[PDB]
């Protein structure tokens, strides 16, 4: 139905960990620079817990917060309460980025077209995971080594996948 391309933005470890105590388990500013680069001028779709961990709006992108809380408001952000209400707010967007966390990944699971996933080669302690996925009809179309250095102390790779509709 939806006219906008539903994309997933995620970084996860060797065991699909994406979260530790409502926080990222690693510090990788270069990966965030890639995220900022890839997502510029596009909607970011965030579960309320994800947004509040980030703490403030992110520049040059539509910020959309998913919550059941009907009284919930945030400055320079937009609040949706259902997948459909998002599709409404995004009815004229070309591409949209589901940005997390896990509950919000689960929610949009059946709608994903494209998949921007950063794979990190390390086993972090974590409580929050990226959902298991049926990769039938999916094709890896891109992969490249991330920048490892003093400020980015881990080995990671940028993967992009596309569902053959």
Ligand X SMILES: NC(=O)C1=CN([C@@H]2O[C@H](COP(=O)(O)OP(=O)(O)OC[C@H]3O[C@@H](n4cnc5c(N)ncnc54)[C@H](OP(=O)(O)O)[C@@H]3O)[C@@H](O)[C@H]2O)C=CC1
Ligand Y SMILES: COc1cc(Cc2cnc(N)nc2N)cc(OC)c1OC
Q: Which does 32 bind (CB under 5 to 8 A by kind): ligand X, ligand Y, none?
A: ligand Y
Min dist CB 36 to ligand Y, Å, is 7
Q: How many residues belong to the chain?
A: 165
62 sits near ligand X (criterion: CB under 6 A): no
Tell me the window of 86-94, 97-105, 137-145, 152-160 that interacts with ligand X (CB under 6 A): 97-105
Binding-site residues for NADPH, in ranges, read 11, 18, 22-23, 48-50, 67-69, 101-104, 128
Binding-site residues for Ca(2+), in ranges, read 111, 113
Interacting residues toward ligand Y by CB under 6 A: 9-11, 23-24, 31-32, 35, 53-54, 99-100, 118
Q: Which does 35 bind (CB under 5 to 8 A by kind): ligand Y, ligand X, none?
A: ligand Y
82 sits near ligand X (criterion: CB under 6 A): yes
> Could you give the CA distance from residue 157 to residue 15 in angstroms, rounded to a whole number?
15
Binding-site residues, in ranges, read 11, 18, 22-23, 48-50, 67-69, 101-104, 111, 113, 128
Min dist CB 159 to ligand Y, Å, is 10
């Amino acid at each position: 139905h939806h006219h906008m391309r539903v994309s997933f933005m995620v970084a996860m470890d060797e065991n699909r960990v994406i979260g530790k105590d409502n926080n990222l388990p690693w510090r990788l500013p270069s990966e965030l620079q890639y995220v900022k680069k890839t997502t510029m001028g596009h909607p970011l779709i965030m579960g309320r817990k994800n947004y509040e961990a980030i703490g403030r709006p992110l520049p040059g992108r539509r910020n959309i917060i998913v919550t059941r809380n009907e009284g919930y408001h945030v400055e320079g952000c937009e609040v949706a309460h259902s997948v459909e209400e998002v599709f409404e707010l995004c009815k004229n967007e070309e591409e949209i980025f589901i940005f997390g966390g896990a509950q919000i990944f689960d929610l949009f699971l059946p709608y994903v077209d494209k998949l921007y996933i950063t794979k990190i080669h390390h086993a972090f302690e974590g409580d929050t995971f990226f959902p298991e996925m049926d990769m039938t009809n999916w094709k890896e179309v891109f992969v490249e080594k991330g920048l490892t250095d003093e400020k980015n102390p881990y080995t990671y790779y940028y993967h992009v996948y596309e569902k053959q509709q």
